Design a protein around this nucleic acid. Structure first.
Ligand code: MG
Ligand code: MG
Ligand code: MG
Ligand code: MG
Ligand code: MG
Lengths: 129, 170, 153, 258, 165
RNA sequence: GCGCUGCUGCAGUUGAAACGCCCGUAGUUGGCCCCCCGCCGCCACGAGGAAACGGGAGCGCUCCAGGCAGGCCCGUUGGAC
């Protein structure tokens, strides 16, 4: 059965971008998907997207512009301490200069840079670069 | 009038307990001096009760009941001190005792994951409470009352019928 | 067809986006309620009731006219069956299998099917015992199923 | 399990705030029971030998004490292991030196020199009120002293001024919001501040929130909060006013002194 | 208890030759034209819904100066559960903010049934919702879309725009 | 060393290895939705609680392994955390 909606969305996005497509459709919508996409948009990877209402299982449309090279999720939400972020950054990211790691906190969904700025920790959602 | 009715019931019960010749001993409240029961007037109290003191309230059943229990926290001679805990009822077969199930989590660092663990804790249940399996109870710590008992029930919250068993840390 | 099989079709129904009644609707929310009343008195299951309403009276969806579903209306009117319909039909099918089998007991596929049906019955009955839609004492027994069928029908 | 009480003390097992060298020896002095406990005291010999340096060995200290050359709260003490505690009076008439034992910000015992006018008394913390024989009201303190027939207006955790010559109460300071205090236990020993809040939990500890003169705020449990007056200290305090510097400023001060 | 209500009530008293209103709210638009929203009590919205197109046309024709819209006043509660200390009080779903806004949107254009909704998330611009109306009806409603957007923004801070598809 | 015990992080057509198939209890895992109330986990801060060891500030035992010393005109000389 379906479980991780975000994983399916990200796999579809990467698949489409691989063959240089321009638009994608991901079937189930969710708040977490929306925040993930908003962060991606603010960082400049996926431009604009739209949410289509149908009362059940809202669909989404996203517009691509290359740029993105990889995206993923970490299924079991591990609890990163505030001072334990560097190890995950080194393990997961190609370099310590341009990748982004997403965390969910009591202060909301933000990036690892922002969490380091506020010296707080939380749970990990995913990554993109 | 209301007061007069209560004394009659309290006065009356002590006499059936004297007519239950199958019992070997006469059970009485230590605090009360046996002798007030021959006073026709109602100028002396016939039942003893106290307050737990941690914000809990004394049930009406204890105050208006007609039972004797030296291990009850309200009408007896024990004191609540220490830790307060919550759990679910696992078994209720003994005369005035139950087994309480407590659920908690254990973390394993190597795998960065958890395990579910449970423990069984026995407690004394006073006749002022009605309890069936699956109910939620609050237990308070007391002095050693027996080989495996150091807790007394002080609150009961009912649980509905055929409710599915669920892992409930408290 | 997934729980007890290997198939996976997708034949379903797709209701409209808008919840309003038809522009040619000429029925107040009550008029249907009486029609439901008389149909139920004739021992008609709700699914057949919806079929009859849709075909004969041109009502695509009852909820869009009355704001409520058929079984809720029946319960408010005190006419809903004690035993839910899906479970009752499963028990019918089990009884039929058992009868055909006691006529002749060399058929193994029939026993296979009976096993599947009883498993489904147990699962659904457990779910209904939870949610307090059935008495806690309700239990399904193979040898007394026909009796319950007769009384609970 | 030992069959009786303990009489020795390994040096490595001694309290840290005594500042005893690892290589001094296997053993350390074992204080005898008295006004103060093991972990809230310091033996006399340590003060007389390792600080003031008037003696260089155990024997010299023994002679000095048995010749009656130190008075503790007006009474000569000949025990080298006698325990000295907080807000005690240390007078040596032979050299006209008078000290009051207090806490430094770092959390160690210090000797603050005093005058003649304020050396006739001491401050005590009352932590227990009980009925003794015949129902007579009583009152105890942190230095293991009991006083009969106290004023009803005196409650627990209050502070009491008593004349050294005569154990009679003069005035008392209540435990209330807005009163200067001094912390005597834990991570914040030696800090001085004013009470801002009091929060109690039924059946557990009571937590006190204090604010320092500079605006810093800190928390500690009520078991080690000592009142030292009404908004202004009643006794002379160290040169610093209960301000703990950060590691950076302490390093700057060290470099300056280098 | 304001001027507008006086003349609208007089109008209503003229129109019949049983139903009363709660209040009247007036919202401004970029043009000199404004909008008047009439807050109908909930139990009689359907009472003012059957033949209300004529009602609004006649009301506009009597007192010109701004268009008239009829909506119901619904309450919004700010807690899914309420803890009295002994039990819990559950908030009905009808009192949520999301349901109320959708009902408002349907009521603003009650005669014409909405066919779809979409919300766009531009790179820099604030997210905005765009709805889809039947392609059959246009010139009737083309001239009252700015007012609809303004009233929706006023009641709900969420912004929007209108198209036909 | 060994990603040859694999949480990070192995392998399972043919090299060693997918139960003959189905039902099924414990166990594990479970779509979307309510803007704030209570509870569990979670994050941060704090109190409280021995040192030695380890880390670490300062000091030329001639250096060093070490030790907590030491200088005169010393934070109240220091042994902070
Ligand atoms: Mg299955
Ligand atoms: Mg399928
Ligand atoms: Mg191998
Ligand atoms: Mg082979
Ligand atoms: Mg092989």
């Amino acid at each position: 059965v379906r479980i991780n909606v975000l994983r399916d969305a990200l796999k579809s996005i990467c698949n489409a971008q691989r063959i240089g497509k321009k638009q994608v459709i991901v079937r189930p919508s969710s708040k977490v998907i929306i925040e993930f996409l908003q962060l991606m948009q603010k960082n400049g990877y996926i431009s604009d997207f739209a949410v289509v209402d149908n009362h059940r299982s809202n669909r989404i449309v996203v517009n691509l512009i290359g740029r993105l090279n990889k995206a993923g999720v970490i299924s079991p939400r591990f609890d990163i301490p505030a001072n334990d972020i560097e190890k995950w950054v080194v393990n997961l990211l190609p370099s310590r200069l341009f990748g982004h790691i997403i965390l969910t906190t009591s202060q909301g969904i933000m990036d690892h840079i922002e969490a380091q700025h506020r010296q707080i920790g939380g749970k990990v959602i995913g990554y993109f670069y | 009038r209301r007061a007069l009715e209560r004394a009659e019931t309290l006065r009356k019960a002590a006499y059936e307990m004297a007519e239950n010749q199958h019992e070997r001993a006469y059970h009485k409240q230590s605090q009360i001096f046996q002798g007030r029961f021959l006073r026709k007037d109602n100028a002396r109290c016939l039942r003893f009760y106290k307050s737990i003191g941690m914000g809990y309230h004394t049930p009406i059943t204890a105050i208006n009941g007609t039972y004797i229990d030296k291990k009850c926290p309200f009408t007896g001679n024990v004191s609540i001190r220490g830790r307060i805990l919550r759990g679910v009822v696992h078994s209720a077969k003994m005369q005035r005792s139950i087994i309480v199930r407590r659920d908690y989590l254990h973390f394993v660092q190597k795998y960065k994951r958890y395990e579910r663990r449970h423990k069984h804790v026995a407690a004394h249940l006073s006749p002022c409470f009605r309890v069936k399996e699956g109910d939620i109870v609050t237990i308070g710590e007391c002095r050693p009352l027996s080989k495996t008992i150091r807790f007394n029930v002080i609150k009961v919250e009912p649980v509905s019928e055929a409710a599915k068993k669920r892992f409930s840390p408290f | 067809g997934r729980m007890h099989s290997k198939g996976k079709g997708i034949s379903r129904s797709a209701i409209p986006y808008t919840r309003a009644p038809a522009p040619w609707n000429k029925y107040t929310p009550e008029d249907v309620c009486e029609q439901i009343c008389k149909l139920a008195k004739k021992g008609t299951p709700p699914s057949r009731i919806g079929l009859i309403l849709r075909d004969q009276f041109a009502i695509g969806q009852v909820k869009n006219v009355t704001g409520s579903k058929i079984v809720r209306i029946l319960k408010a009117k005190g006419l809903a069956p004690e035993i839910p319909e899906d479970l009752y039909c499963m028990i019918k099918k089990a009884v039929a299998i058992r009868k055909h089998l006691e006529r002749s007991r060399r058929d193994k596929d029939s026993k296979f099917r009976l096993i599947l049906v009883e498993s489904r019955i147990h699962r659904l009955a457990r779910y209904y015992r939870q949610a307090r839609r059935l008495p806690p004492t309700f239990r399904y027994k193979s040898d007394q199923a026909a009796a319950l069928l007769a009384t609970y029908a | 399990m030992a069959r009786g009480v303990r009489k020795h003390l390994k040096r490595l097992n001694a309290p840290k705030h005594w500042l005893l060298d690892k290589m001094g020896g296997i053993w350390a002095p074992r204080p005898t029971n008295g006004p103060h406990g093991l972990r809230e005291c310091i033996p006399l010999i340590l003060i007389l030998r390792n600080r003031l340096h008037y003696a260089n060995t155990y024997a010299e200290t023994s002679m000095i004490l048995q010749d009656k050359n130190v008075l503790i709260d007006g009474k000569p003490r000949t025990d080298p292991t006698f325990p000295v505690g907080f807000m005690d009076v240390f007078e040596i008439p032979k050299v006209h030196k008078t000290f009051r034992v207090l806490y430094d910000v770092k959390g160690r015992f210090t000797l603050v020199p005093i005058q003649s006018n304020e050396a006739g008394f001491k401050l005590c913390r009352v932590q227990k009120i009980f009925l003794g024989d015949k129902g007579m009201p009583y009152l105890s303190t942190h230095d293991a002293r009991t006083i009969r027939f106290p004023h009803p207006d005196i409650k627990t955790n209050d502070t009491i001024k008593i004349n050294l010559k005569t154990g009679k109460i003069d005035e008392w300071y209540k435990f209330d919001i807005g009163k200067i205090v001094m912390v005597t236990g834990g991570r914040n020993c030696g800090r001085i501040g004013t009470i801002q809040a009091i929060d109690k939990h039924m059946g557990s500890y009571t937590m006190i929130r204090m604010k320092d003169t500079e605006g810093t705020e800190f928390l500690t449990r009520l078991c080690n909060v000592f009142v030292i007056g009404n908004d202004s200290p009643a006794v002379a305090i160290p040169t610093t006013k209960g301000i703990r510097p950060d590691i950076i400023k302490n390093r700057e001060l060290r470099l300056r002194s280098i | 208890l304001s001027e507008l209500e006086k003349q609208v009530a007089g109008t209503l008293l003229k129109l019949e030759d049983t139903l009363y209103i709660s209040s009247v709210k007036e919202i401004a638009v970029d043009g000199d034209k404004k909008a008047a929203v009439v807050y109908v009590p909930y139990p009689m919205l359907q009472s003012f819904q059957k033949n209300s197109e004529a009602l609004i046309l006649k009301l506009e024709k009597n007192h010109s100066g701004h268009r008239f819209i009829i909506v119901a006043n619904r309450t919004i509660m700010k807690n899914a559960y309420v803890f009295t200390g002994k039990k819990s009080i559950r908030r009905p779903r009808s009192r949520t903010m999301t349901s109320v806004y959708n009902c408002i949107l349907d009521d603003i254009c009650y005669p014409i049934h909405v066919i779809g909704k979409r919300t766009l998330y531009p790179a820099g611009s604030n997210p905005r919702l765009q709805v889809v109306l039947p392609k059959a009806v246009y010139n009737e409603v083309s001239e009252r879309t700015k007012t609809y957007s303004a009233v929706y923004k006023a009641l709900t801070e969420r912004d929007t725009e209108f198209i036909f598809m």
